[PDB]
Structure 1
């Protein structure tokens, strides 16, 4: 109905009564349509009488028609006359002739049916598929009382079989007497008599073996009866039949799904649950473990009022026909839905079962039919789960009813969270440098097609068209007059531009579209790095916001000129790069001895280098007098001087717009400083990439973002102009080889030859020689690189591009000129040849072949890595959906300590290297104290660059800041604890989805992390909390490390200072080398602390958590992830990893239930844990002890309270099976659930405080108007 009356979405088992209450009929015949008239057939799968009419408002024959007969049913055909779209809504149901079991609750490991009934999965599969009988009832009373009468009968029968046995023995004796009489009365061979006698005694041995067979056949059956109890499986139906004919009463046995039905019927959940609870409480061991797992399914059917019966089906619901359409494709060729085949099979087998039971058939045929019906329902619900999948034409599996939901191509992920949209286009992008940062060229044809609903209206209003259809005709023929109207419609109507993949937020940005001539979207050069879009065919898509809210969001939140800083680290993303950096570096660089320079020589003439104003400087530049890169002194009267000269000449209130000063700089630096705002002081620095980035950072921090956008645009223009004028170009004469190359190659080939000799004399093995040669040639490559670096002039276009920060590193320059160096084996090792030639010299054939290995390996690795990083990003987004800013402040005292500078041994504070990503953009939780003095900066400060400067000046290192980890608010986090928003540059808003931003910021730099595990796999196993490969154990208690030296192992024993119970470590492998504890490596009998890693590598986060509480595992995780990301050279603020880590540590393991519905081993949320403790302290206190646990991103995501998000995340079938068993209601509170149900997400502009803002004119405005 309405997305506001959508408070909850409950899932549970659908009993047969519910299934036949949904149904509007029963599909009784396995038919779809008529072959000739091509109309729905009666009682068929597409029956019009059940699911409604194929045409709006008609009965099947035609008697009743049109809306005037709405809600009626024709008495001839029985079709209800209503809208045909109800065929997408009404369901049917097949009434199975015999019960079947839902496959989801049988095959899905763990078998929930088995756990409920305590039947082994093999036994359940035997019973359900008619391979073994099972006993469902036993009259213990009549068993007990007749245990003597039937004992008497069995004694009689045993006596009779023994009597025939002894009669057979006597017959043997008589025949043996005859045989011996024959043997010893007539003349025979000495052995022939013994041959026949042994033959006869062997016949009697066989007779006694038959007697033993009978004794077994009777006594085994009696024993089987004596222990006959319910839920006992009976293979070898011969024994079963003998039992039924003999002790048929005293026990009831069945076979198949109906037997499980009877078992569940005769199954009191309360008593079983109570017995299981007693067993888990009193017993222990593996028995208790199996008991506990069974109580996760036996409790679910108790806590809720759900029957355990929904597992066994008596009716199968039939999906509405239009969800499985039968369409007449062009050419008449009909196209089934692949589900009508499975339904047809089910109905055929059900009807055949009905007929077989009606006729009266031997149990073999009817049981085979029942097994087939069970298999058909299984295939309908899940193909290929048991046995070979049911295949259709072409030998392909039939798309079952569950395959529609699972996978990347399933329904939850291909049609609900991601959809195709109207009002969208795609085209190749071409750079437009004449655009402004908030503009994008939009091809005329694409814009006209996108906006044609609007253009039709406008050219009807202008009277260029008479009505809407005429206007549409003009648009379809692109009449010459519909282009100006287009320009009038497109005005200030933002369009979102997207480039797949959207690795982060700034991959969708709203631009004010401008019309361009042909077929290409003109993108601004600056937003390229935001999109990661270069112009070699990088198509991108354009979406058109329609509603007022959509336009407002595109214009305010997403405008490209509003998104300059990266949300990950806050560094500018729209700053100039490549050509513009080269242009600005060329413009602002100074070259001594240039034309027009400044010379102070006297005695013959004045300095003859000084200029009265920048206008005169540019006039001189026009003449061949003054270069733009020549040191001069100029009189400046419109650009503010730097802090030192300002404080000297002005001191206090230097008002620069009018005052004049002397600037000893180049003209290019003056021209550049004219691009920056008026308030910005003179820079007077060569503009490397780093310097430009720092300038833009400072500008964004101090000035409004509009000023930032305009300054950035002017910088782009100047950079392009002076990159054109820079004359950077490449030629084989601009690539200089080092002149000492041959001497170096000879000097190192001598060492290589010495190593080869040494190998030839057996001095060292193959591996050692390979390593030595690798080292030699590595040193050689280093030396030739140094020679090349020192040989190059500082003016060369190659080195100028590399060393101006524009692009490229010096390794590429060395590869181009000099020595490419060693090359990687296809396996991964280093080939020791090596490639001893440059790319300017040209590689030989074999050198090129050796080179190709690593390049192909890298191109395959890049694909696999982008896949892995995308998967990790998906997991990180899904885990932290529910972390969004809710409040402004917790007022929580708890905080995290950050070290900042480190005290020098001689005494000095050196700034910590990784401080920009740790302490910046954080809020102080506790006031800073310097030498027990006053406060340098108190709590509740953004802790920006001036703050850090002041702290380092004071002489204080550790400071307590507020972080999401120690955030007291329960739902999401708060603005203050989260801190400053890196993108916006100020305190975060009260609706920001910081979880999504954190996930995207962590997962975008992946695909640039060049994978102990040390790259993307390391981050993957850190977030997943998996035990690492290099499980390096850490100490448990402060003590002395009694170390040994073992063979194939070690023992890092430790004798504590608690003196308690010294623990030893296991077969710690010899390959793992010892760690460097503080300078001295771990020495035998050395005092270690509580956490000092003993062996090299990583320590599994779980152990460090168990040993040091949650805070130290938090620090360990953040430090390890940040170390992995720094090792490659990527900067991510610590707060994003902190958000993810916070999401990982939110649950507690239950050790003691207490007396409140808490299973041992259950992972329960800490907030709910505390709430239950508060509820239980009163009315009798039974504290349920618990212990912190570190989950992973996948486990933490799939444990959410919403089944709609967990199901759409991963393992849809398991999630839905468990949710159905538990009767879980989804409150529809996260972002994924709201997206799925198509209602406003509770973040950003959708929260309840911003959405229902009341807007009205101010009273004075109304009075004026």
Structure 2
């Protein structure tokens, strides 16, 4: 390696070769002068050690004499190890025509196209631009076209839009764990410096928008273009290779929008009226006369495959929600109406898509998922589902249950201090009564949350489901479960220890009120345990998957 300014460094092998040549010359000289046998045997020992150090290192005496505490590199170290020649430059290579940036979300894009910055597109497709320019006669030599694209004329943008119009690309997230780790899309120019990506596709990559970075690759040959558009196209990957369950399941926001869209109340604007079709239903909603969700008699013109591909039209008059009729506008011909009569949670829309692809086909399923995405984000934006401190009501029976449990543990203490039971039995009784108190508090808070809302209906009052924001987020299955709500509103039960035992003193506090230092210091144990588990799980899984992919 020639350093700057006359001087230069050297590799580790050169020292070994110099040592071997020097000792060989010294042995030749000692054979020339007929030295006594001890000297030539010492020289032979030195030469054997030098050859051993050149062929391998770290096996005889770890002799290096290269630098300060740094074992030099040999041919075994060239081939063996993590950074050996194989795993560094044979399997995982480094390829041009690539690039990386930070990803971001974009709602106005279909699931068969992705965003792309302009500078990246201008930098990657330079050969295609040169070819098209010198084909259209806008440049004589390659130097002319190179200087013109360096000057960044206006017409090169048109040339770029022409040459990229129908040229697919590839995307790639750094942790690749399965077949769907690398897919294909069609690029669309977007001003900026960040790659926009389809919302529903992000669920397959398992890549949140907390700053994750992806990579791009451009196929060159025509066969690769065909392989990308046919095999690795995002529209062809709708079912997981592991299980028959789909991969285009809506995750977080559109599910909340739909769940808020299809549910009836006790009294709304314009309840009891009639309507012809969903069109005038949406018209009434946009006019503001009728509320979003109310029981309205409407007529629908559904369809059904009577024969092997023969649709039959029919009419009906059902009692349904205005929002349900509005959602029916994007439903294709083949699906029945009884699929949208329920609350349409997460599993509901999952099986909806499952039955949609099972009957109609590919393109109807794709366009139906697209329309679901658009309308769900629209009505989720128009919903206005916020969160406040009043959204978490704490039942009044919690204090009394905690006082009863305290009386119980005090009585158990007073009984054990006289020697009636053993320590383990006392511990078991205490943990059992605290678990019972936890169950009681959980049932109390669930009863308080799920059905607190009572509203009159033309005089008399009546119970109904609740419209609490946190309850709508929990029940719809968007994020979290019942355990997290139990931890926020009620107590979080008991905690474990690094040993694995359970402390007899439970966490007698919620997250709405403050926590004393002791309970937080205890919960730190479980927090750090989970963090360490998540830290080491990837290090184990990498080697596991590597062995499994190497064995078969």
Distance 1:720 1:332, change over 3 A: farther
Aligned counterparts of 1:576 and 1:843: Cα–Cα separation in 2: 36
Task: Please state if 1:519 is matched with 2:193.
Answer: yes
Deviation at 1:486, TM superposition (A): 1.7
Give the Cα–Cα distance (whole angstroms) in 2 for the partners of residues 381 and 505 of structure 1.
Answer: 41
Do 2:115 and 2:190's aligned partners in 1 also have CA atoms closer than 8 Å? yes
Matched, 1:534 2:223: no
What is the deviation of 1:342? 2.0
Shift of 1:489: 1.7
Residue 453 (structure 1) shift: 1.6
Task: Please tell me whether the aligned partners of residues 262 and 323 of structure 2 are also in contact (alpha carbons under 8 angstroms).
Answer: yes
The answer to whether the Cα contact below 8 Å between 1:384 and 1:390 also exists between their aligned partners in 2 is no
**Offset of residue 610 of structure 1:** 1.6
Out of 502, 505, 509, the residue aligned to residue 830 of structure 1 is 502
Residue 128 (structure 2) aligned to one of 454, 463, 472: 454
Match 2:105 to one of 405, 415, 431: 431
Residues 514-663 of structure 1 aligned to structure 2 (within 5 Å): 514-598=188-272, 609-637=273-301, 639-640=302-303, 655-656=312-313, 659-663=314-318
Q: Match for residue 839 of structure 1?
A: 511
The aligned counterpart of 2:31 is 357
Judge which range, 660-669 or 811-820, deviates more: 660-669
Aligned mates of 2:425, 2:30 — CA distance in 1:
80
C-alpha contact (below 8 Å) 2:252/2:479 kept by paired residues: yes
* 1:806-955 matches, cutoff 5 A: 806-880=478-552
SS at match of 2:542: helix
The answer to whether the 8 A contact 1:498-1:542 is kept is yes
Looking at structure 1, the residues matched to 537 and 423 of structure 2 have their Cα atoms a distance apart, in angstroms, of 33
Question: In structure 1, how many angstroms separate the alpha carbons of the residues matched to 2:124 and 2:255?
Answer: 37
The CA distance in 1 between the partners of 2:64 and 2:420, in whole Å, is: 66
Task: Output the CA distance in 1 between the equivalents of 2:436 and 2:79.
Answer: 58
1:347 paired with 2:2, answer: no
2:433 matches 1:776: yes
Say if 1:423 and 1:543, in contact at 8 Å, map to a contact too. Answer: yes
Q: 1: CA distance between counterparts of 2:364 and 2:172?
A: 25
The answer to whether the 8 Å contact 1:496/1:508 transfers is yes
Please state whether the residue corresponding to 2:312 is helix, strand or coil: coil
Secondary structure of 1:409 counterpart:
coil
Question: Where does 1:295-314 land on structure 2 (aligned, <5 Å)?
Answer: none
Q: Does 1:706 align with 2:363?
A: yes
Aligned to 1:791: 448
Indicate the residue corresponding to 1:114 in structure 2.
Answer: none
Alignment CA distance shift 1:836-1:390 (3 Å): same
For residues 59-458 of structure 1, the aligned pairs below 5 Å read: 327-458=1-132
Cα distance change of structure 1 residues 453 and 616 upon mapping to structure 2, 3 Å threshold = same
Give 1:1021's aligned residue. Answer: none
Deviation at 1:612, TM superposition (A): 1.4
- Cα distance, 1:560 vs. partner? 1.1
| Cα distance change, pair 828–477 in 1 and its aligned pair in 2 (3 A) | farther
Distance 1:757 1:879, change over 3 A: farther
Would you say the 8 A contact 1:342–1:379 is kept in 2? yes
Whether the 8 Å contact between 2:98 and 2:124 is mirrored in structure 1 is: yes
Equivalent pair of 2:276/2:298 in contact (CA under 8 Å): yes
Pair 1:800-2:455 in alignment: no
C-alpha distance in 2 between matches for 1:333 and 1:427: 39
Alignment correspondent of 1:749: 406
Contact 1:590 1:686 (8 Å CA) reproduced:
no
**Per-residue Cα deviation, 1:1025-1070 (whole angstroms, up to 9, x for no partner):** xxxxxxxxxxxxxxxxxxxxxxxxxxxxxxxxxxxxxxxxxxxxxx
Greater fraction of residues in helix: 2
Q: Contact (CA 8 Å) 2:334, 2:360: kept in 1 or not? A: no
CA 1:470–1:830 in 2, change beyond 3 Å: closer, same or farther? farther
Give SS of 1:663's match. Answer: strand
Q: Counterparts in 2 of 1:471-510, with a 5 A limit?
A: 471-510=145-184
Q: TM-score, normalised by structure 1?
A: 0.41
Correspondent of 1:667 among 311, 318, 322: 322
- Given that 1:629 and 1:667 are in contact with CA atoms closer than 8 Å, whether structure 2 keeps it comes out as yes
Q: Do the aligned residues in 2 keep the contact of 1:349 with 1:373 (CA within 8 Å)? A: yes
User: Residue 281 of structure 2 contacts residue 326 of structure 2 at CA under 8 Å; is this kept in 1?
Assistant: no
Q: What does the per-residue CA deviation read over 1:484-537, in whole Å, with 9 as the maximum and x for residues that have no partner?
A: 222222212111111121111111110000011111000100111100111111
Which has the higher Rg, Structure 1 or Structure 2? 1
Rounded Cα–Cα distance in structure 1 between residues aligned with 2:57 and 2:415: 65
Kindly state the Cα deviation for residue 378 of structure 1 after the two structures are TM-superposed.
Answer: 2.1
Distance 1:535 1:331, change over 3 A: farther
Distance 1:632 1:585 in 2: 18
Cα 1:448–1:654 shift into 2, 3 Å: closer
Give me the CA root mean square deviation.
2.3
CA distance in 2, matches of 1:797, 1:546: 51
Structure 1 residues 754, 614: closer, same or farther in 2, change over 3 A?
same
Question: CA 1:388–1:777 in 2, change beyond 3 Å: closer, same or farther?
Answer: farther
Tell me the CA shift for residue 764 of structure 1.
5.7
**Distance (Å, rounded) in 1 between the aligned partners of 2:188 and 2:283:** 37
Residues 615 and 782 (structure 1), Cα distance of their counterparts in 2 relative to 1, 3 Å cut: same
The alpha carbon displacement at 1:724 in A equals: 1.2
**Distance verdict in 2 for CA 1:805–1:355, change over 3 Å:** same
Kept after mapping to 2: 8 A contact 1:584/1:722: yes
Residue 577 of structure 1, CA deviation: 1.5
Residue in structure 2 matched with residue 679 of structure 1 by the alignment? 334
3-state secondary structure, aligned to 1:622: helix
Please, what TM-score do these two structures have when normalized by structure 2? Answer: 0.91
CA contact (8 A) 1:575 1:712 kept: no
Give the 3-state SS of the residue equivalent to 1:824 in structure 2.
Answer: coil
Match of 1:691 among 348, 354, 377: 348
Instruction: Return the alpha-carbon distance in structure 2 between the equivalents of residues 333 and 810 of structure 1.
Output: 69
Q: Name the SS of the counterpart of 1:483 in structure 2.
A: helix
| Greater shift in the superposed pair: 345-354 or 398-407 | 345-354
1:766 and 1:369 map into 2 onto residues whose CA distance is 76
For residues 250-300 of structure 1, the C-alpha deviation after alignment (integer angstroms, 9 at most, x for no partner) is xxxxxxxxxxxxxxxxxxxxxxxxxxxxxxxxxxxxxxxxxxxxxxxxxxx
CA–CA distance in 1 between the matches of 2:270 and 2:431?
53
1:766, CA displacement in angstroms? Answer: 5.4
Note the C-alpha offset of 1:391: 4.7
The offset of 1:862, in angstroms, is: 0.3
Q: 1:628 to 1:745 in 2, by over 3 A?
A: same
Q: Distance in 1 between matches of 2:34 and 2:422?
A: 83
Q: Distance in 1 between matches of 2:419 and 2:19?
A: 75
Question: Judging changes above 3 Å, is the alpha-carbon distance between structure 1 residues 827 and 361 closer, same or farther for their aligned structure 2 residues?
Answer: farther
Is the contact between residue 744 and residue 780 of structure 1 (CA under 8 Å) also seen in structure 2? yes
Matches of 2:289 and 2:326, distance apart in 1: 17
* Conserved 8 A contact 2:281-2:325: no
Q: Is the 8 A contact 1:576 1:715 kept in 2?
A: no
Can you give the 5+ residue segments of structure 1 that lack an aligned partner in the other structure? 1-326, 599-608, 881-1265
In the TM superposition, 1:943-1022 aligns within 5 A as none
Distance 1:516 1:768 in 2: 69
Answer yes or no: is the 8 Å Cα contact 2:279–2:326 preserved in 1. Answer: no
- When the two structures are aligned, how many residues end up with a matched partner? 534
Deviation per CA, 1:862-907, whole angstroms, max 9, x where unpaired? 0101111121111111112xxxxxxxxxxxxxxxxxxxxxxxxxxx
Q: Is the 8 A contact 2:254 2:376 kept in 1?
A: yes
